[PDB]
Design a protein around this ligand. Structure first.
Ligand code: ZN
Length: 47
């Protein structure tokens, strides 16, 4: 919400290789790095 919002888009931009990966892939394809954020935001109630 405020103080920095999380990309509300689908695909996520990697940090190591900085490659474009689908929101379905749990990990990257180039560097094969595990997506950050252990907890799933979904947990909370949608708008
Ligand atoms: Zn990567």
């Amino acid at each position: 919400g405020s103080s920095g919002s999380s990309g509300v888009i689908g695909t996520w931009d990697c940090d190591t290789c900085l490659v474009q990966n689908k929101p379905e892939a749990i990990k990257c394809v180039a560097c094969e790095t595990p997506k950050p954020g252990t907890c799933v935001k979904r947990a909370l109630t949608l708008t």
